[PDB]
Design a protein around this ligand. Structure first.
Ligand SMILES: CC(C)c1nc(CN(C)C(=O)N[C@H](C(=O)N[C@@H](Cc2ccccc2)C[C@H](O)[C@H](Cc2ccccc2)NC(=O)OCc2cncs2)C(C)C)cs1
Length: 339
C-alpha cells in the first residue's frame, strides 16, 4: 500500500508528525535517511545547554499502557556534534492513521538536538553501541521493516519529494511512488553500501567544468547541505570562489560573497546515465547577519543533503538495495504506485 506522510519544511530539516503510544502522543520528528533509529524527546528530559528540545512535542512513557521498556541504554552521535542519550523501549507507532504495534524506539532523557528524529535507513546502521563500541542491544527491526512485516507496505521502500526551496510541504510515501513529479525515467542505482544509502557519483559539473569523482555518496534527508572530502571540496571551492574560514578550533566552513552570481546550475552525474541538475542558489545559504555560507562543505564522508535532494525524486528500496533517481518536477499533481 501507499502511506503518504507530509514533510514540513522547517528550514534545515524536514519533519513529519508521528503519534506514539496508546494515547497517540503527537511528536514532530525529523525524517532521516542518514540514521536508522527513531528516538523521541521525553517529557522529563534535560535539554542540552541553550537548546529547546521540547517545542516539537514530547513523550511520556507513563501515560501509554502499551509502552514496554527494554532496559538497554541508548546513545547516538550525529555528524554535527549533536548527541542524544536515553533508553530502549517498545510501543505503538501511528503515521497518518496506520499503526504498528511493538516498534522498538529510544526514549531520550537528554539531547543537544532540537527535536526527535525518525531514522529510516538499513537496520544494519542502528546505533546499538555505547561510546566504547561495546554493544547494548541486538540490531532490531526499525519502522520501515515493521511496516512491511505487519503488511502495511508491500516492500521496504519509500520515495522522497522535498519540493522547491520556497515550498512549505513536500512528501514521503512508504511502499508507494508518485510517477507524476519527475521527468525522464527513474534510473535505478545500486546502493554501494550494505549500511548506508549511498550511490556511485561519477562526476560533478560545476560552472561549466567537469570534476571527476568516482566514489559513493549518501542521499541524506537529514543533512541540510552538501559535503565532500576536503581535497575535492577544495577544488570545487576554487572554481566557485568560496573561502574556507576557520570559526572554531578544528571546524572550518566555506563562506561565499553574498552577491555571487548563481544563475548557473550544478550537475551530478551518476552511473546509469542518470543526471540531476541543481541551480546555484542552493549554494548560498543565509546566516542571520550579513554573511552567506557555501552550500557545499568539506567532510570525511560525502553527503548529498537537502540542498541537493530538493532536485530529485527518489525511490528508495531497501529490499532491493536500489535508489532510483529522476530530475525533479514541481507540481500540485501526483500519481502513486504501491510497489
Ligand atoms: C540549525 C540546526 C537545526 C541544524 N543544522 C544542521 C546542519 N548540519 C550540520 C547537519 O545537517 N547535520 C548533519 C547531521 O548530523 N544530521 C543528522 C540530523 C540532525 C538534526 C538536528 C540536529 C543535528 C543533527 C542526521 C544525518 O542523517 C546524519 C548523516 C550522517 C551519517 C553518518 C556519518 C555522518 C553523517 N546521520 C547520522 O550522522 O547518524 C549517526 C549514525 C549513523 N549510524 C549509526 S549512528 C551532518 C551530517 C552535517 C542540521 S540541523
Amino acid at each position: 500500500d501507499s502511506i503518504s506522510l507530509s514533510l514540513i519544511n522547517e528550514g534545515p530539516s524536514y519533519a513529519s508528525k508521528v503519534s506514539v503510544g496508546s494515547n497517540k502522543q503527537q511528536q514532530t520528528v525529523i525524517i532521516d535517511t542518514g540514521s536508522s533509529d527513531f528516538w523521541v524527546v521525553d517529557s522529563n528530559a534535560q535539554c542540552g545547554k541553550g537548546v529547546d528540545c521540547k517545542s516539537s512535542g514530547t513523550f511520556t512513557p507513563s501515560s501509554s499502557s502499551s509502552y514496554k521498556n527494554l532496559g538497554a541504554a541508548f546513545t547516538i552521535r550525529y555528524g554535527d556534534g549533536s548527541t542524544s542519550q536515553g533508553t530502549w523501549g517498545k510501543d505503538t507507532v501511528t503515521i497518518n492513521g496506520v499503526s504498528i504495534t511493538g516498534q522498538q524506539i529510544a526514549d531520550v532523557t537528554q539531547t543537544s538536538v532540537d527535536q526527535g528524529i525518525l531514522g529510516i535507513g538499513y537496520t544494519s546502521n542502528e546505533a546499538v553501541y555505547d561510546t566504547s563500541g561495546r554493544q547494548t542491544t541486538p540490531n532490531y527491526d526499525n519502522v520501515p521493516v515493521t511496516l512491511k512485516k505487519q503488511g502495511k507496505i508491500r516492500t521496504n521502500a519509500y520515495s522522497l519529494y522535498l519540493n522547491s526551496p520556497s515550498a512549505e510541504t513536500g512528501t514521503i510515501i512508504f511502499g508507494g511512488v508518485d510517477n507524476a513529479k519527475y521527468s525522464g525515467k527513474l534510473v535505478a542505482e545500486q546502493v554501494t553500501s550494505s549500511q548506508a544509502l549511498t550511490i556511485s557519483l561519477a562526476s560533478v559539473n560545476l560552472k561549466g567544468s567537469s570534476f571527476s569523482f568516482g566514489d559513493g555518496a549518501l542521499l541524506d534527508s537529514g543533512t541540510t547541505l552538501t559535503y565532500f572530502p576536503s581535497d575535492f571540496a577544495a577544488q570545487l571551492a576554487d572554481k566557485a570562489g568560496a573561502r574556507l574560514v576557520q570559526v572554531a578550533r578544528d571546524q572550518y566552513l566555506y563562506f561565499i560573497d553574498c552577491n555571487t552570481d548563481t544563475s548557473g546550475t550544478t550537475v551530478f552525474n551518476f552511473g546509469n546515465g542518470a543526471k540531476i541538475t541543481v541551480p546555484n542558489t542552493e549554494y548560498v545559504y543565509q546566516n542571520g547577519d550579513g554573511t552567506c555560507l557555501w552550500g557545499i562543505q568539506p567532510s570525511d564522508d560525502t553527503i548529498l543533503g537537502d540542498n541537493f535532494l530538493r532536485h530529485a525524486y527518489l525511490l528508495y528500496n531497501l529490499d532491493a538495495n536500489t535508489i532510483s533517481i529522476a530530475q525533479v518536477k514541481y507540481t500540485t499533481d501526483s500519481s502513486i504506485s504501491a510497489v
